[PDB]
Design a protein around this ligand. Structure first.
Ligand SMILES: *Cc1c(COP(=O)(O)O)cnc(C)c1O
Ligand SMILES: *Cc1c(COP(=O)(O)O)cnc(C)c1O
Ligand SMILES: [Cl-]
Ligand SMILES: [Cl-]
Lengths: 304, 302
């Protein structure tokens, strides 16, 4: 039989689709919106919780607190609802109403922080909360929790490897927490020994901290429009050593490519998905990439 | 390998999830929002197109024409863009503006039809555009094209049978085109021979045309809020003979049950999904249903 005991167990097994009009026919797009909550974040929402349960830190009585409210917050709310945990989400008061209605519909307890302070406030306001009662509260922290890249090493990676029968030559991932890039690469280059896999990190041209970091330059972030990626720093879950190339994408290239994905391929993609595919197109302008099969993660449906 | 040649080929194989708080533990919800375009309609959008291609009527340069007021047009738009077809959608002026904006944004050529005539006028107009140039245009009519229930007989049904190892006892489907109910039932009662499967059609209490039709009464529809179901007439794709029971659901029951799905199960469900599950709850109020495995279609997300 194949009956899932709860919605959190339905994560992954997302489809790999050949793009026929965008690129040379060798761009294979992994559609992470085919997940509960419509984004790749459901994999880590699920595993960070399962991991906490296995470690014995999450159990009856313990409750969750997260500064998140973007794709990870939604992912944590659905898993919390499905598995019976109280969840408190802190978020700058700037968030859309439908966004909070959705989180509340999922049963999350919302705590709004000073709009001007932005996410930096919610992050502070959450550590304040957990610090207030360290035993009662659990802060997961997607940027450094190993269970983040671990789920990609155990599911996303194997899926890419099996779906291409090992025929994956390049792997492109827009970096947010870095967990997808890190986990998939560890599985393919490490576990499967395909050391000639080319791992490409994608980031906004206006906040190129990975390229800065790799070049030994000072980290200087900037504002950009590619929601989901470009956090402005190097996350603990991003292993810079696994990166073979970094491609910077402009807000305009990301948006226009996301539109091409719907119009030319019938794939409803978010802006970061457009950015990742734009990176694939850039690489294909280089003759060394011409006959390589490129697997690209499309993180979410967008928001639209 | 498992590389899909285009997004239309990725339909189906949706998860069956046990509901743990809602109901007695025997309600298994099939999540149709895990499909491209986020609804069960991608199955028919894809198969009507694949079928037309197989029949030889759909060919490059041929433009699709389909009447719609909801999810089918949206799914057809995804599928059309994926396989390279231009698409025209006829829809009544009763349709909301946001809905019109969304459909155009997805690439469809929109033809609004007389508000007074409803869906009947939209299908009427679709046929006329086709007849205006039959070599250029191909009609894809979801209420009568048998490729609709056919895809459910070939994918949804088998998925339900394999996922429950044949242990499904009741099948609940809120009816719009009726294709899901018809195809799944044909597969399970017919191909698999499980004649005692109890097939349940769900409809809005305020527009109980299936109950009316089965009672031999005059069909008198009414306004309701369960989007996606209750077309107000008996679709050619609804085989009334396959229905064992009809459960009427109120707007309030549908909405509150959809909310329970989100909060108690972490399942993002649309109103018609709440309606289908509310019907399951109603059946479990009856001792004869207490130990049965109930499979319920959750057509789309919230
Ligand atoms: C999280 C996310 C990413 C980046 O994924 P990471 O595994 O965190 O690198 C990209 N786009 C969107 C929309 C995301 O939510
Ligand atoms: C199409 C649809 C249904 C009904 O499915 P049928 O197979 O057409 O009867 C129910 N709910 C929603 C939201 C739908 O889009
Ligand atoms: Cl899609
Ligand atoms: Cl869901």
């Amino acid at each position: 039989s194949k009956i899932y005991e709860d919605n959190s167990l339905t994560i992954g097994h997302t489809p790999l689709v050949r793009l026929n009009r965008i690129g040379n026919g060798r761009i294979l797009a992994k559609v992470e919106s085919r997940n509960p909550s419509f984004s790749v974040k459901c994999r880590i929402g699920a595993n960070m919780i399962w991991d906490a349960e296995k470690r014995g830190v999450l159990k009856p009585g313990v409750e969750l607190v997260e500064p998140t409210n973007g794709n990870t917050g939604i992912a944590l709310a659905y898993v919390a609802a499905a598995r019976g945990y109280k969840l408190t989400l802190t978020m700058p008061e700037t968030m859309s109403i439908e966004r909070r209605k959705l989180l509340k519909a999922l049963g999350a307890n919302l705590v709004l922080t000073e709009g001007a302070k932005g996410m930096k406030g919610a992050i502070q306001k959450a550590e304040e909360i957990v610090a207030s009662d360290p035993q009662k509260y659990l802060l997961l922290q997607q940027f450094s929790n190993p269970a983040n890249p671990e789920i990609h090493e155990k599911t996303t990676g194997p899926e890419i490897w099996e779906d291409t029968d090992g025929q994956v030559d390049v792997f492109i991932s827009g970096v947010g927490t870095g967990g997808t890039l890190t986990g998939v690469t560890r599985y393919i280059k490490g576990t499967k020994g395909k050391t000639d896999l080319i791992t490409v990190a994608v980031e906004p041209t206006d906040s190129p901290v990975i390229a800065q970091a790799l070049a030994g330059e000072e980290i200087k972030p900037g504002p950009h429009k590619i929601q989901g990626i470009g956090a402005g720093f190097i996350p603990g879950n991003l292993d810079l050593k696994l990166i073979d190339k970094v491609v910077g994408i402009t807000n305009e290239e990301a948006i226009s490519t996301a539109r091409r994905l719907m119009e030319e391929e019938g794939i409803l993609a978010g802006i970061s998905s457009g950015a990742a595919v734009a990176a694939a197109l850039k690489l294909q302008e280089d003759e060394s990439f011409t006959n390589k099969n490129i697997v690209v993660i499309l993180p979410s449906s967008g928001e639209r």
